[PDB]
Every structure is written in C-alpha cells, then in structure tokens.
C-alpha cells in the first residue's frame, strides 16, 4: 500500500504521510485501521526511529504522532541510553526540556494537549533516572526557580515531581537494581526539604485550582515515604482538613492524603502528636457535616442516584473513616469531650454500610469485624458503642448473603465474614439480638416485609448465630422460630411459597445440632419429614432434603447408632429397612448422597461385627443388582453395549464410592465382596473400548457408548483410590489388593492407543505409591515400565495435548521420586536420561500444575543423589547432568516467560551452586582435556557460567557477568539475598551498560 | 410446647 | 377533584426449552458455540407460521431466528445422545439471511427427544 | 453513541476470549497471543437505546505489546483483567493501572478476575483489594461459564450514559424469511461426524 512509505528510512520521513497513517489508525476502522496499525508498530520498532523523533516533535501538528515519537524515545532511554555517544544524550535531554518549556508557555497548547505534556514529563523522568543527580545536580534548584515565573510551569513541575516520586518509591522494586533504587531514594530524600517548601507555599497561597490539585496529587505520593515531621511540625494538616475539604475540586485528593496520613509512622509517646491526630479528624468530620451531608443523610439513596462523583466520594470516605478509626479510635474513647466525634464518625459508617455495593460493603464489614472483636476482648469498651452495635445488628441481619448450604465463592467468603461479626455482636448483647430477630419474624407474618429474599436473609441470619445462646435460651428460641416458620404457610398458599419456607425451616434446624441431640423425638420427626420431602418433585425440594439429611447426620450421628430409650432399635436400622421406599423417587446422585450419609452413621458403630452387619445390610440392593449383572455380563459380554446396563453398572460402583468415602478403612469388607469380580469387569469393559476403537476409529472415544464404558473404568479406579488412601491395614493392601490391580490396569494402559488411555490410571497409581510404595519396590518398577515412556511421548510434542495426563504424570513421578527412588536407579541409562529430559520439560511449562512439580522433582532428585554419597551412580549423575540442570534452570529464570516459578527456580539454582562450593561433588565436572589437572570445580563452574551467560546475553560486559557470578556464588547460603541478586541480574539484562558494582549491594 | 411443634411439623405437607 | 401526580407480541409460544446452540465452521473443521438460553417455537397469530427464536441469557441477544422449514431434517451427532444436527438456509440472527449447519444440545436425552417432536409438529403446521 | 474501551492485562488472562464470547458467543479454547491490538465493535441494546463499544483488545505479552500505552489515547473506559489461578497476574494489576491512568486520568475502569470456574483458585477473594483506593469496580468473572460476563459492560454503560437504571433489553426479532441438495449433504456429513465439544457440560 501507499501508507507503508514511512517504513523506508532511505528517504526523508514525510511527516504528512505519518499523520495520515496515525489518523487512519486512531480514527478509522476495519482494514484501513488494522493496516495502519501494523505499519505504526513496524515503524516504532525500527531501532533507528528515535533519530527521527526530534523532527516529529518540531514539525508534526498531530499530538498522537508526537506521543508515538515519545514512546520511541522512551524505549531508547530505558534500554540503550548508556550506549549512545554522550553528544546524543545531552541533545535528547535538551529538546525534551525545551519541548516541555514551549508547551507550557503557550496557554492554548497547555490546556488542550494534556496527554502529550504528561507523556513528555514522563519521558523527562526517564532521563532523570539515568542522569540525576550525578550528571544534573541543579535539576531541583532550577525546577524550584522556574516554578515562580509561571503558574503553568509550576503546575507541570508538580506533575514531573509526582511521577518522579512514583518511579523512585512506588514502582522501583521491580524495575531497578537494589543499588540504583537506593541511590535515587537517597537523592530525593536529600533534596526534599526544598521540594516541600515549594509545595507548602503553593498550598497556603491558593491560586489556580488546577495548580492546587496538582500539588495535592504530588503530596499524596510524598506521604508514602517522607518523614512524619514534614506532616506534624507544619501547618499542613490544618490546611488539608479545613480549607481543602470545602472545595469539591480539591476534596477528593485531600481526603486521600488524609487517609495516608492516618498511616504515617508516628510515635505513641508524644501527646501533642496525639492531639494533632485528633484535631485533623475533628476538622474533617466537621467539614463533611457542614459542606457535604449531615450524619442523618441517606447515603444508600445518594449512592444509588450516582450523581457526579458522589460514589467515589463515599468510597473514599469509607476508606478514610475505617483507616483512621482502626488505628486511632482509642484516642477518642476516654476524653468525654471527644465522645460525640467518635460516635458521629461511626454513625457515618453505619450509613455507609447500608449502601448497595458489594465491594464497599466488604470494606466497611472488615472494619466492623475489627471493632466488635476489640469490644469482645477489651475491658470497659463495649458500652461506649451500644447504640452503634444495635444498629449494626439490623444492618448485618438484613444484608446477610447465601451460605453454602441453602456456586459463588465470593458469596461464601462474605457469609463467613458476616457470620463472624454477627456472632461477636450476639455475644456482646444476646438479648438485643434475639429481640431484633423475633420482631423481624413478626413482620414476615405481617406480610409487611414478607418476600422470598427477606425470609431467606432472616433464616440465614438466624442460622448463623448458632452457639451464641445458652442451651435454655436457644431451646425456646429455636422452638419459637420453627413455629413461626410453620405457621407462615397457613397464609402463603402455592407450592413455590411452600418450597421457600420448607428450605428455610430445614436450613435453620440443620444449623442447631445441639438442640437436635438433646431432643430425640424431635430429631426423628425432622428426619422422617426430610424423607417425605424426598418424594416431592417440586424443583429443589429433593436436593434440599438430601443435603439437610447428610448435614444433620454428620453432626448427630451418635444418636442414630445407639438405641434410644423408648425405641425398639437403633434408628439406622429403620433407615436401612425402608431405603428402597425412601429413595424410590430420587435421582442417582441424590441416592448416592443418601448412602454416604448412612455410611457416616455406620462408621460410628465400633463393635466390628455390628458395623459389618449394618454395612452388608446397607449394600443389599447394590450387591444384588451387582450379583445379577456379573452373572449376565459374564455369560453374554455383548450386554455391556446396552446403555441401560452400562448406566446400572456405573451407578452401582458410584454407590460403593459414596459409602467408601464416608467409611474409609471400615469399607474393606464390602470392597472384598466385589473386588475380584470388579477387576474382571474392568478387563471386559477395556476390551470393548478397544474393539469399538478398532471397528469405528478414534471417533469412537466420543460416542455415548464408549464414554459410558470408560465411566465404569474411571469409577472403579476412584473406588480403589478412595479406599487405599484411607486404609489402615497396609499389609492387606499389599497382599490382597495391589497385585490384581496392577495386572488389571497397567498393561491395558500401555497397549491402548493414546486417545484411549485413562489419565485416572496415573492418579490411582500415585495413591498406591503414596501409601505403600515403600513396601512394593518391584511394583513401582512395574508401574514405571508400563506408563513412563508411553505417557511421556504423549506430552512432549507441545504443552497443550493431553492436559490431564500431563498433570497426573508429574504427580506420579514426584511421589515415586519421594517414596521409591530406587526404581529410577534400576532404569537403563537411556531411560534415566528421558527422566531428566522429562523434568526439564516440566520447567518450561507455563501451567503451574506442571511447573511446580517439575521444579520440586528436580530439587528432590538432587537431594536423592546427594544422599547416596561418593558412589559411582552419584558421580556419573553429576558428570552427566549437573550442568544440564544449572543451565536449564538459568534459562527459565531469565527468559521472562516463567516468572511464576522464580522462587523455586532460585531455590534449585542455589542448591546446585552450593553443592560445588561445599565440595559435595567428588569428581571433576570437566574433561581431562579442557582444563588443567587440579582445577577446582569452583573455578570451572564460574568459568562455565561466564561463557554460558556471555553467549546467551552478548550485550553484557565481561565485568558485569563476573561481578554477578562472584556475588551469586558468595550468597549461595542466603536465599533472600541470593534472590535479590538474581532480580538485579534480570533488571540489567534488559538494558545496556548496567553498573557491575550493583552486585555489591548486599556487601 | 415442643410437643406442639412436633405435631405441627408432622402435619406440614405438600 | 384532585389531579394525580421485542417484536414477539404478535406471536404465540408453542414450545420452550433451555439449550445450547452450535455453529459448524466448515473451514476450521470444528463446532463453535453461538449461544445458551431459552429456545422458543413462536407461532405468528396472522400467518400461523412457526419460527425458532433463541436468545442468549443476560444480554438477550438473538442467536437463532428462522422458520422451522418443512424440508429440514434433524440428525443425530456422533458424540451425543441429546443433540440434533440440521442444515439451515436462512437465519437472520446477526443480520442478512445466511446459511448454517446448526447443532443444538439439551439438558437431557428426553428434552432432546421432545424437541424433535415439537420440531416435527411445527413442521407440519407450516 | 459510541465509546472507546481499552482492555489490558497480563498475557493469558483471557482478554481476547472474553471479547470473542461477547462478539460471537463462542468460547475459544486455544491461546493465540494477540499481536499489538485488535479493534472490535460491540453493540448492546438497552432501555436507553443501543450503545456501541469500540473495544481495543491489547496484547499482554511484552514482546507483542506493539504501541503499548499508545493504544490508550482517548479511551473513555477500560477493563483491567487478571487470572485468579495465577498470582503474578494480580501482582501486575497495579502496573497496568499505572500505565493506563497516566494517559486516561478520569475514566470508569472495571477490574476483572477471570477464570473463577477453575476449582484450584490461587488469588483468594479476600486478597483482592487493589480496586478500593483506586475507585475501580471489581467483578469475579469466567468467560468459560459466563459467570458475571455481562457485568463489566452493564456497569460501564451506566457510567458512560449517566443512568444508574440503564438495563439490557431484548433486541427486536424481525420475522425471518421463508425460503444444491448435494453440496449441503457434504457439509452435513462432516458436521454429524464431528463430535460436539464439552459433552459433559450441563448443556
Ligand atoms: N478455564 C478458563 N479458561 C479461560 C477462560 N478465559 C480464557 N481462558 C483460556 O485462557 C487462555 C488465554 O486466552 P486469551 O483470551 O487468548 O488470553 P489473552 O488475555 O487474550 N492473551 P494475550 O494478551 O497474549 O492476547 C485460553 O486458552 C482461553 O481458552 C476462563 O474464563 N476460564
Ligand atoms: Mg489476546
């Protein structure tokens, strides 16, 4: 196209052609825009574009074109500054300084091109980081001088200083070496006395509102780091908390400054400091009440209307009040003359807490937790806040959110925080809480506040405070609540209303197990009702009954396993007798929840014979269905293509998993009933999957038929995994379970095509190794032989295919490396080398699941080799793989695509380096040829790394590399400092000419 | 009174 | 006496079901989601002609809008017992009439079967 | 009635996937790194009429950053994205915010923690507080499950139009037209034998 002409630097740059490209990009659309976009990026990435920037800035009339010219300059200043001839450095400085002066002097330009001026100021600040103060000692005095000659230049100097403070104190940890950050911090500290002078004069003497705002913006930055004396030994707090709170232009920034002041480092001895801290709070609250809104104002309504900047102001006010009062409210609690201020501040917070804004509510709720926790533990404090706490009780009760039981993890977190505060508030005044809740409930029977939302929020609140009342008070409170909830349906007809109320009733009952355990007759009536509900097909009822059933059982199980006074048998027997009836109308996953609940009860029976008898009775139905279809499936293997038979099988095994989940080690007798026929079924299903894949192709793995068959395999593996992870008799695991299992699963996995291998096999094997790996060394060897090479070949052509196999593969290798390292020693050398390859391959993943295990395997392997002492396998390991691990770890450390693993990469690297500098490696890491005899591995390591880094980072000086390695080596016992030195190196490789003395920062 | 609650709960039905 | 202070209205709902709709990208050889929401068969009150109209949850944007033409045929998909595949010649969800190979998946095999019924009922209607 | 929106955040966080979901309804499973920026019109229908977002979907990977903050000039709103399964992407939120507001000093901004559908959540709800002092709206979102996926645009539309009561409404549905038997039978054959994705989803 025509636009691509600016990309030809052999001709003079046509400024008008540049502005056409720029306008097409910023103002056009579609292909025009997308094409100019690719041209511009191609333009600004030309490493000679910076030479054409003074042209743009002198002669262009398009401020975007200039902005782009400054970005091109910024890239040069940040990376290649020190490489330029010094003439260009002084030159670039001059026409940035001059371009800024000219833009400030033209009041038309100054008011209408704020983006370009802010970009130019930032560009200047990049020069300052390179040049100041060592090569620019008069920048600050001359900045103070020029400020007096023009409001515009003075305003812009506040912007420059704001940005400089940000770059030096707020964003330097990442982007500078430790030494260079300290140099700039100290340099700013040295000259701040006169920076402050200027800033204080501007504030006291009024002037342009735009100038005042810009000065307060910079002050906000200074407060992050300046000494407290500049804040308390001047008049500035008075100005902030009075003058600048009255004007809406300065109010937002001033409030943020005062929030930071409420965090300064401040001595707690000085009574005059204490009085100044009280005073600026008194002034601020006074200005709010007279200039913004009174304490009575309806902030919920104001926030919802969202006029102008009200919402941001109310957010900022919440942050100010919460920040200040968490640090300083004790300053207000003893002086009777400050009581009104303390309670007015909290009344504002009460009003802020009624706003409908989730994140703001979380901010105020955090503060309430801070308050009520202190009132709960600190003597003589709670009575001060009685009226505040009473209002807070209503606020929290009315804004309670859904607990887990009645998916959204933000809501689960918020409920827990609300519960904590309300529990504290109930301990502080249990009578007030009960009365608020009772009366809220009356107005649910009124109909005056009745609604699905309002009865749920109240039931959750009522449930949330379980444990705060005495048993006797709780007794009549619970009774009263259920009564009122039951009577509620006598007016709310319809099944939708009847469902809400039911769910709330069972939610409240489920939250008060102490009550249920003392009143058996009542607990039984509850359970029998839940069973009734399990035949109710209205949406959500059945799922409600089941979740309530297992929740009550977890808390009250002992009362189902004993025989109760006036009963003929333990109630668990009654449940089991009618289980077919009770569950006849549930879906399979609800049936499984039911069986799991029964297993919870059964495990409370500690007489072995009774527990096993209950267990055999519970499994009667699935065991009969199981026996039936093992007879049929074995006599006619085709039946397993009948989907209905496949689903019955899957549900039987899922039932065994559910019961095994709650019974764990006690499940063993039931496992023994099905074990050998279950693995036979595993073999049969496996053959059918293979036959289908042979007859239909890989697409077979997507059909419902095969997915049904693989569900059986996965559930069998999950059952075995569930039991073994909880077994207490590991001799039986080893002697009875492991051998039939490995014979059933390992060869099938190895000899299936990749798309038909189940990653769950790897997960199951991981659990086997975890629990009994130490007892089955030949079994571990067999696992590796069957899954290692064939799985590796699935996952070593890219980082995306077979994601689950990837994850489980490295979990398996990790556990084997922990529990049975001997198995890797038996690998033939070519296989041990693939193992090393597989570890490094894990390093290079961006997926945390793989990367973390990869770095941990590497670390554990080194420790395993080290333990072996001076023997030949350890010697050959270092000869073969020490420098592979060092260099592979360095690669991911320095390539900028594996930032998330920095800490574990650093740990691994420090361990590797420390081996050599403790002479823990007994043989030379070098060849006979390449180095004189006698050379220490220390000398050779530093030499290998110097050469490695020189070729990998050719723009580093030899001195940089040598200084970095000398420091890194000296620091290989101090991980914190070691890491700091690695960070410094990562900074320096991004630029040219880094200072090698930076690596002496630690000393 | 807990006897009252039980009777009322037993009768609560769809 | 005190003085005091969608273009579906002309149609009827025969069938409504929750479903997920897919568009086959022939060039890229893969299915691509087009929307999840309520799928409705709407009967014009004047013409008695029936159309499918489907909107996305929340944004309510239209992801299907076309007549249940009598020539269309619902076919199964190799990977699902709860979906139907069928060719569509004029859909106007995103603008000018365009043709698609659609797939629609439901929460259960029985929802899919009933949809097939209503689909063929409505086919006769037209 | 159109507004420039810039979308920024670390590479891999799902910026392009989130937009594509809104543009076509598709969920793209592959990570193809954006190069520089992709501009996409995006229209929503509201009770105050249609609103058009010109979405500037920028690159998060530094080596593909292109013009970087040059893309922010004259934006009228923005979304900052991170990934709740990757802590580093939350640690970099202040860096993206810094670069963003230096160009756009007073625009409504939404902070989005994406991928909340993944069980192994690494950036816990209680650790997400950066938005408080910066007056950003925050939402947990998932472009995969569509959790809250409309909230960033609903909130921005209310801020940009100045109506706290603005709502998304149903776009009008014109009557569709009533209207090579072997060319479509070839496309149909391939379509039947290409398995539908995510066959375990509830839909
Ligand atoms: N589980 C899950 N994955 C998601 C979600 N959103 C996006 N992804 C996936 O994350 C990966 C990266 O998506 P992408 O949109 O390209 O990220 P990006 O922010 O545009 N990267 P870049 O800045 O380089 O262009 C993709 O594989 C995508 O499918 C999500 O909400 N949940
Ligand atoms: Mg992208």
Numbering used by the authors:
A (entry chain C): -1 to 376, 414 to 441, 457 to 1053
B (entry chain D): 265 to 278
C (entry chain B): 64 to 68, 78 to 198
D (entry chain A): 9 to 187, 193 to 216
Give the original sentences from the paper that presented this experimental model.
The chromosome region maintenance 1 protein (CRM1) or Exportin-1 (XPO1) binds 8–15 residues-long nuclear export signals (NESs) in hundreds of different protein cargoes. NES sequences are very diverse but each usually has 4–5 hydrophobic residues (often Leu/Val/Ile/Phe/Met; labeled Ф0–5) that bind hydrophobic pockets (labeled P0–P4) in a hydrophobic groove formed by HEAT repeats 11 and 12 of CRM1 (9–16). Here, eight new structures of CRM1 bound to diverse NESs show several different and unexpected NES backbone conformations that share only a common one-turn helix element. All NESs also participate in hydrogen bonding with Lys568 of HsCRM1, and mutagenic/structural analysis identifies Lys568 as a selectivity filter that blocks binding of non-NES peptides.
Because most previously studied NESs have substantial helical content, we also study five NESs that match class 2 (Ф1XФ2XXФ3XФ4) and class 1b (Ф1XXФ2XXФ3XФ4) patterns, where the hydrophobic residue positions do not suggest an amphipathic helix. Histone deacetylase 5 (HDAC5NES: 1082EAETVSAMALLSVG1095) and Paxillin (PaxNES: 264RELDELMASLSDFKFMAQ281) have NESs with non-α-helical class 1b pattern (Ф1XXФ2XXФ3XФ4), but the peptides bind according to the class 1a pattern instead. Black dashes show CRM1-NES hydrogen bonds and polar contacts, and unoccupied CRM1 hydrophobic pockets are labeled. *HDAC5NES and PaxNES sequences match the class 1b pattern, but both peptides bind CRM1 using Ф residues that match class 1a pattern. (A–E) FMRPNES (light orange), SMAD4NES (salmon), HDACNES (slate), PaxNES (pale cyan) and FMRP-1bNES (deep teal) bound to the ScCRM1 groove. In all (+) NESs, main chain carbonyls of Φ2+1 and Φ3 residues in the 1-turn helix element hydrogen bonds with the ScCRM1 Lys579 (or MmCRM1/HsCRM1 Lys568) side chain, much like niche3/4 motifs where carbonyls of residues i and i + 2 or i + 3 coordinate a cationic group.
